[PDB]
Amino acid sequence: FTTWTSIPTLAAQFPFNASDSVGQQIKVIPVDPYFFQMTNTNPDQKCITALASICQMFCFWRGDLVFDFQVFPTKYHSGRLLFCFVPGNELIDVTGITLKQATTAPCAVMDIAGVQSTLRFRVPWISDTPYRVNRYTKEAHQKGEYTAIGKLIVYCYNRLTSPSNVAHHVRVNVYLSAINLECFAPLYHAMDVTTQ
Amino acid sequence: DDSGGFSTTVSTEQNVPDPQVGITTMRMDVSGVQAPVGAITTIEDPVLAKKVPETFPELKPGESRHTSDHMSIYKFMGRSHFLCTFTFNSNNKEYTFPITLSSTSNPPHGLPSTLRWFFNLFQLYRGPLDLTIIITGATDVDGMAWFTPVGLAVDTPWVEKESALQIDYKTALGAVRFNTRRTGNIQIRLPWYSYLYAVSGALDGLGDKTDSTFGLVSIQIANYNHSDEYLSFSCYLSVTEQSEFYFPRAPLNSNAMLST
Amino acid sequence: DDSGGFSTTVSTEQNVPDPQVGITTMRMDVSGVQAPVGAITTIEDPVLAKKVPETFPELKPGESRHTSDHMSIYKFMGRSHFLCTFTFNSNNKEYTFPITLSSTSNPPHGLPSTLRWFFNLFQLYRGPLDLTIIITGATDVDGMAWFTPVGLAVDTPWVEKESALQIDYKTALGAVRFNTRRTGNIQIRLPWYSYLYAVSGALDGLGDKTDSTFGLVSIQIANYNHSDEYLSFSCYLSVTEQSEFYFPRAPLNSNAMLST
Amino acid sequence: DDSGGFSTTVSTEQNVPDPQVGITTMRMDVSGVQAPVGAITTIEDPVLAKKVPETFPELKPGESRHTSDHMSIYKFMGRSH
Amino acid sequence: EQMIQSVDRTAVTGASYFTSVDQSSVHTAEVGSHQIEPLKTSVDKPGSKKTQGEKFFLIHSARWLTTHALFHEVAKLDVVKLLYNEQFAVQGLLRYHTYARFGIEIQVQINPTPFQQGGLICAMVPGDQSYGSIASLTVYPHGLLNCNINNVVRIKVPFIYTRGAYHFKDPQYPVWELTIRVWSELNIGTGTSAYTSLNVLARFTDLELHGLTPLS
Amino acid sequence: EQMIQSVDRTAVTGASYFTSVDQSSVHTAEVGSHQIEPLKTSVDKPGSKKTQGEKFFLIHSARWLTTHALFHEVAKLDVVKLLYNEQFAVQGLLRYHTYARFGIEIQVQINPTPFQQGGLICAMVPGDQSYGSIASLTVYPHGLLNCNINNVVRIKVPFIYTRGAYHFKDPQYPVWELTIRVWSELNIGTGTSAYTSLNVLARFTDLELHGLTPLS
Amino acid sequence: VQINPTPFQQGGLICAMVPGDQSYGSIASLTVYPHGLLNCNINNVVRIKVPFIYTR
C-alpha cells in the first residue's frame, strides 16, 4: 500500500492576497493524514486524497508527513510566507500566536518568485504515544486520544509587491504524502470534508 | 529507439510501484550536518520530483514491535470481507448472485463497503478468489451450490425463483452438496475461468456489462421447510496468493463509498 | 554519567525480577559451621538488603516430584479463566462487551475474580490474548462474532439491542460464522491492534477511559427462536506466549477482590 | 558546521585587512595581450567583488625612492599629535 | 576566450529547521572569525541542556508532626507537573517543546533530633495510587527513613508510560506519583520539638525533547 | 571472624551544580534501566541548545515605498534586544542565564516586480550609528539589494564588544545595530505597485551561556 | 501537450492519462495516473509515455 501513500496529491487551496497585513494567519492545517477539503460541483463529489484513502482503513497511524506547497506567481510578484509547526494536538487555541512568537516553533520561510516552485515541508514525528488513533469513528471528544500531532500555520511574512498589470494575488496548492508511514489494526470508515 | 523517436533529454520512470516496506526497520541519523538540498525542488519535472525530501535534522526511527506487515495487500485482504446476504421464503427455490467488480452497481446489488473500496484502487484483476458462505437459520435443509463462468446460460441474477436448468447441467459445472444441520459453513475456491485477460471495475457502456463480471455463484435449497422458521445465507470474499493486481488508480471519493 | 551527576557512593539495582526458580532442585548443606553473618542487617540500605538470609543450620531440600513449574505466569495464566456471561431474549439482537483491564469497572461490568486479581499485579500489558466462548442453550441458531479495536465506531457496550452497523462494516473487520447445533465452542485469538504502546489497569480520570481498553468483542445472533428456550453465552480468557508483562505493582487489597 | 546550519553556496571572507603594502615595490607588464575579463563584474556578489580590476594595458610602476612606509599606522601615529 | 562569472540564482540556507529557497541568491559576507579568550571573563562551563535541565530543584516542603497517625499521607505530589512551572530553569526548555521522554531522580531529606523516634516510607508509584495495599509499598522503588539510622534517601527510575512520550500542555495522566506515608508514629518526650521538616528534591535524567512549537 | 557491613554516613550527590553533603546517607535504589525505542514515536532529532537557539527567527517587517527619498532609513533595529522576547524559542535559554557570547547571522529578503527599479544597503554597524559617513557604509559587513540582480543577502559576523560578555537584564549598550538605507530610489510606471515588502531574519551562532540565575 | 502564455499570466493545468473511464475517482488524486503539470511560470510542454493497458 505504499504505492498510493507515497504519491503527493492535492489537499488544500488558498490565496495569498496583496491586501493582508504582516503576521496575519492565512490558513491553519491539522497535521494528520485524514485532512482534505476539496470538492467538486458537477458531479457532486468530495475529492479524497490518496493518503486519506489508505489511512482511513486503519485504527492507528505513525510516520512523517510531507507537505508540498506549490505557488503560482508571475516573475513579477514578490513576497514571503512563513510555514510554522506548533506541536500538540488537533484542539489547541492557536490563533493567539503572534508572528514573533511563531519563530519559537520549528518553521521555514519561502521566497515566492524564483526558478523553483515547490517547498517540501517534512514534519517530524512528535508525540507522547507511539501511535495515534483514528478517532473520527467516534462522535464525542475525549482528553487523551487524538488524531493529529499538532497544527500548521501559514503567515504573511513580507507583503506582496507587484506592478499594476498583473493580478493582485498568488494562489498556493497544498499536497499531502507520507514517508516512513506505518499503519495497523484495520477497520472500515468513509471520511468527510474538513470544513475548518 | 525502436519506434524511430529522438530526444535530447532523459526520460525516466514515473511512480514506480512498492518503493518502501511499510514496517519500521533498518535496511546514526537520517539528516545531519550537511545542508538539506532536498527542501527546495520543482514538482513539474519528474526527474527532480524523485529527490528524497529532508528539511530538519532527524534520526532513525528504530524497529517496530510486531512481526507482521499490515501494509501488504495479501495480508490486509487476506482477511475475509463481507459480500452479500439474502433469505429464502419457500420450497425448492433457487437464488443467483454475480460477483460484479463494477462501481456502477450500487449495493445491495453490488459490492459493499470494503470490497467496493478495494476493487476500485486498481485497473486490472486476474486470478482466483476465495468464497466462504455461512448458513444461519433452519436445520435439516439440503442445499447445492455451483459456479458458472461468464458467457454461459444461467438463471436471472438477484432473483429468487424456480430453477429452469436441469440436474445434468448443474452437476456438470461442478457442485457441492451440504446439509444445514452438520456444517453451517463452506469454504470454497472460485476458479479463474474467463475468455479474456483480466476483469476491471471502473468501466461504463457495454464494457461495463461484459468485462466487469468474472464468475457467478448460485445456490438451490431443498427440504425447506417446516411450519415457521427462517433461513439466511451470508457470503464473504477473501483473496489468494495466485491472484494479481495491476495499474494503480485514483481511489473512490467520499460519496461513492457506500455500504449495506 | 550522561546526565552530569556525581556521587561518592555506589548505586545498585533494586528488586531485580525473577531471582529464583520456584521448583525444588539443585543449581552438602545450606548453612554450616561458619557463623551466620546474614542474621543481622540494615533494611534501610538497598545494598545490605540484598544479603542472603540465614540464622540456623540447615541442609538442602532436595528435588521435587512433579515436572512442571506452577509458579510461572505462562503456565498459571495459560489456564483459561472466567470473563463474562449473558443471555439473549429476542430475535436479531446484538450484544457488545469490551475487555477492560480497569479496576474501577466493578463486575458484572468488568473483570471478575481471577482476572481482576492478575491484571492489577503489574503496570503495562502488551500482546495478544486468547478468547474461548461457550454456547449453552438453544439449537439451530446462526451467530456471528467480530472484533473491533479501540477508537472505531461500534454499538453501545454492555447493552443488548438492534445493530446500527451494516453487513459491509461487520465483515470488513474479520468475523467468524458459527451454528449452535454443530460446535458449541469457538477458540479464537484476539490481535494486538492498538495505536499506543501498552494498556494498563490502575488508572483514573480520562486516562482510565482511554488507556485501559484494548479491544472489544461483539456477537450478533439470528434464527433465534422457537417458542420457549433460553440461549446463554460464556466467555473465557487465556494468555499466549506472544504477550508481555512489565513493572510489577502492589497487589489489590482484600476489599477490591470481587467476583460474580 | 558547529551551529547546525547548511547551505549549497560558498561563504567567503569579506574585506580582509591589509591586502597590500603601500610602497611601490616588486613582490614585464601588469596587463597584457590577454583580454581584460575583470572590467565587467557584479558588485552585489562578495565573491565576484574580490576580482582584480584591469581595463587598459599597463606595466609595472617600479620602486619608490624613500625607505620608510608612510601608510603604516605605527609610523603615521608614531608622530606625536 | 575568458568566462565572466555571475552571481548564483538558486541556494538553500538555514539552521537545521528553517529552510529558505531563494530564486535570487548571493554569497555570504563574513568579517573576522571566532576567537578564544586567553583571559576568560567566566570560568564555569557554558550553558547547555545538561546543566539547565538535569539539575536538582526543590519541589515540595512538608512537615511531619506527632499528631499524624499510622499510614497518614504526609506528601502526595505529582512529580512532573510541579517541575512544569515558571520558577524553575527547566521551564525554558519545556515551554517551547511538545513531547518529552525522561527519567526521574528523587532525593528526600528530613532532620530529626536524636530524642525523636519514628519512621517514614517514600515510594514512587507510576500513574495512580490505586486500590493496592498500603502494607505492600515496598514493592515499588522506595526508601525507608528511620530517625535512628539515616535522614536522606535517593531513588532513580526510568520512563514508564503507556505512550511513547509525555505531553505537557494537555497530559493524559501523571507519569509518576510520589507518596510519603507515616510508617511508624513520631514520639517525643517532654520539651522535645513536636515536629520535623521535610523536603523533596527532583530532577530529570536522560531528557529527550521533540517538536518545538509556537503555542503554549 | 565475619564483618557486618553497615550503611554509609557521608556522601556527596547532585547534578553538576547542586551539591548535597549528607551526614546520614544511603545507597540509591534504582529499578529498570534506559530502553531504546525500536518503533519510535518521534522521528526528528531530540531537542538541544543547537536546534533551539541556533535557528532563524523573524525579527522585523518593514516596507519600502516610492516616497522614501535618498538615504532614508527604512529599518533601524537593535538585533539582540529583539531576540530577547517571550515569543521566540531562544528566550527559554536566555531568561535563566545571565551572560552570553555569540555570533549573529542575518538574512534580509525583499520582493520586487521586474517593472520596478532601485537599490538598498544593509550594513551591520556595531554599537552605534555614530557621526560616520553614510556614503561609507560599504566598510562594514554589508549587502547590496538591487531590484534587477538579487533579492536575498546574508551576513555573518563574530562577537565584537568592549567587555567579555553581554548582560541581557541590564545591558550597557547594544552589541550590533542593523540599518537599511535607501541606496537608490524606487521608481515605477503607471499602474505598477508603489511598494515592496521587506523582512529580516536573525539567529545566533556559537552561543555560550554562563551563570544561571533565579531572578529575571 | 503544448500551451503558450505570456509571462503576465498565472495559473496551472494538469494533463492525466486515465485508462478506460474517468470514473467515480477523486479529482484531487489525478497525480496517481501518468500525468504532467503545466505552470505558466515554469514550462509550457509536457510529454507522457504509456504502455498498452486493456482487459483483452
Residue numbers in the entry:
A (entry chain C): 51 to 246
B (entry chain A), C (entry chain A): 3 to 29, 40 to 272
D (entry chain A): 3 to 29, 40 to 93
E (entry chain B), F (entry chain B): 5 to 220
G (entry chain B): 112 to 167
What did the authors write?
The structures of these 5 complexes are almost indistinguishable. that these NAbs prevent HAV attachment to the permissive 2BS cell surface. binds to the BC loop of VP2 and the BC loop of VP3.
of HAV by F4, F6, F7, F9, and R10. regions of light chains and heavy chains of F4, F6, F7, F9, and R10.
